[PDB]
């Protein structure tokens, strides 16, 4: 109930002559394949990205996607001639396909976005247009659903080969999906936009996996202006996240930032604002503040 596999294809069309299509493939937070337009061949980004398939079966899977990539390019270009001059270039199309996997349970999906709006999915047997999708797409969906062959193979690719593959992939990269990287935290402070206040900032970086807990605390009392940040990625497949708290100036002392994470056991990290440790960390990162926000 906790792992999701996504083939993200992004395809760009600029004029009647210029196209490119680049895909990436995620398993959880972990990127697992890359394929750029200028590469004839899919590329592994983990040593286990072939999953549990043999080379004869992987290379066949590969060979079909290569046929698909080239045909999808002509098809979209033909659909643009079909709709001319209603829709025209530049045109951007995104496919998201794969399977989330519950505990032998699968649900599979294939979703298309036209100029950044989700518009069409494959469901059951055919491509169908979603609620709120523009009426003019009706005809293109009529012509693509005439192709019974592609409907037969997409049906195979979602109902059977996706789970099949991804279960092998789940066993093949166990130790990486369960890898535990310890977070570390530091403190900093900024002017609040409210006159007289300060925004305290508990930085937290370097944790894997993604679940984490960060609260500004006054003793036993979770401070409830604690604003959690967005998760931001590091280049080493660890995560980064800050939590802020807007205090009045002078009200900092006694506040601590607490972090709970899987990789610590129960030995939570705690930074007390006024502590000697913070003071030493602070004078190693002084600077002239030129070009601050």
């Amino acid at each position, epitope marked *: 109930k906790n792992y999701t596999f996504r083939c993200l294809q992004m395809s760009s069309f600029a004029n009647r002559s210029w196209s490119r299509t680049d895909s990436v493939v995620w398993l959880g937070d972990l990127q697992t394949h890359r394929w750029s337009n200028d590469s004839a061949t899919i590329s592994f980004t983990k040593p286990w990205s072939q999953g549990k398939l043999s080379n004869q079966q992987w290379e066949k899977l590969q060979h079909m996607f290569q*046929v698909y990539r080239v*045909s999808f390019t*002509r*098809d979209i270009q*033909e*659909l643009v*001639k*079909m709709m*001319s001059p209603k829709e025209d270039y530049p045109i951007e199309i995104q496919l998201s396909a794969g399977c989330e996997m519950y505990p032998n349970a699968s649900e599979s999906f294939l979703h298309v976005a036209f100029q950044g709006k989700y518009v069409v999915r494959f469901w059951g047997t055919s491509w169908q247009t979603v609620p709120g999708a523009p009426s003019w797409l009706d*005809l293109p969906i*009529k*012509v*693509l659903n*005439a*192709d*019974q*062959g*592609t409907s037969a193979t997409v049906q195979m690719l979602l109902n059977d080969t996706c789970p099949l593959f991804v279960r092998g992939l789940l066993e093949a990269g166990k130790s990486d999906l369960e890898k535990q990287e310890k977070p570390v935290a530091w403190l900093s402070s900024v002017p609040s936009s409210a006159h007289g206040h300060r925004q305290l900032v508990c930085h937290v970086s370097g944790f894997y996996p993604k679940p984490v807990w960060v609260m500004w605390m006054r003793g036993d009392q979770e401070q409830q202006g604690t604003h959690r940040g967005d998760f931001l990625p590091n280049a080493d497949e660890t995560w980064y996240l800050q939590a802020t708290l807007d205090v009045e100036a002078g009200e900092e002392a006694g506040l601590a930032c607490r972090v709970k994470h899987s990789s610590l056991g129960g030995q939570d990290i705690i930074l007390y604002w006024g502590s000697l440790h913070h003071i030493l960390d602070a004078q190693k990162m002084v600077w002239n503040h030129r070009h601050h926000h």
Partner: T-cell receptor
Amino acid sequence: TQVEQSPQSLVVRQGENSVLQCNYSVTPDNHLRWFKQDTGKGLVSLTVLVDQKDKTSNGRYSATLDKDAKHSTLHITATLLDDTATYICVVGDRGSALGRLHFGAGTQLIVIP
Amino acid sequence: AVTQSPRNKVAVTGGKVTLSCNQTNNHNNMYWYRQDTGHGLRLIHYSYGAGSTEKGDIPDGYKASRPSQENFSLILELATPSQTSVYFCASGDEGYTQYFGPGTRLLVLE
């Protein structure tokens, strides 16, 4: 150049069978149609195969398609003399109007009495 | 049924030659080919509906034209003896099947 028929010309004696071959390199290979064309006339379809390994039939005409070898054969059982024509092999690369058709240059059938 | 017009034409090099094609099937999609000993049919122009004309593989020498759903015209604004040929029309709906007309024999002489 991407659909190729063979023999280029075939003569047979009336009443016997005759076999006509189509080899192609179209990708992707969705379906294979066979046409009969009398001189001056147009194109009468005879049969169309679509599966990966297919046999069809219309009366005295029967055809195989093996998409693995990208190869089809058209068999005429007991040729009549009306049967002399060019037989044309056509491959369409989609299962829909987005497809392009790919035409053989034909084979010339000559039935002699 | 798909019909063509004229069905035999003698043109002179340099002249404008118009080949009409008419279809009463309500097919959005129409096609023009030519046939020449040695190759099969080669696609010249096509069309996905009224107002649309699109180049095929060998369009040089021809303009196309689709004023209505039912009529599709191959224009030779400057006739060449390279364009002596048999010219076939076809139409189709969304499906993969194209329905061919009876042909048109055109000779362009000096």
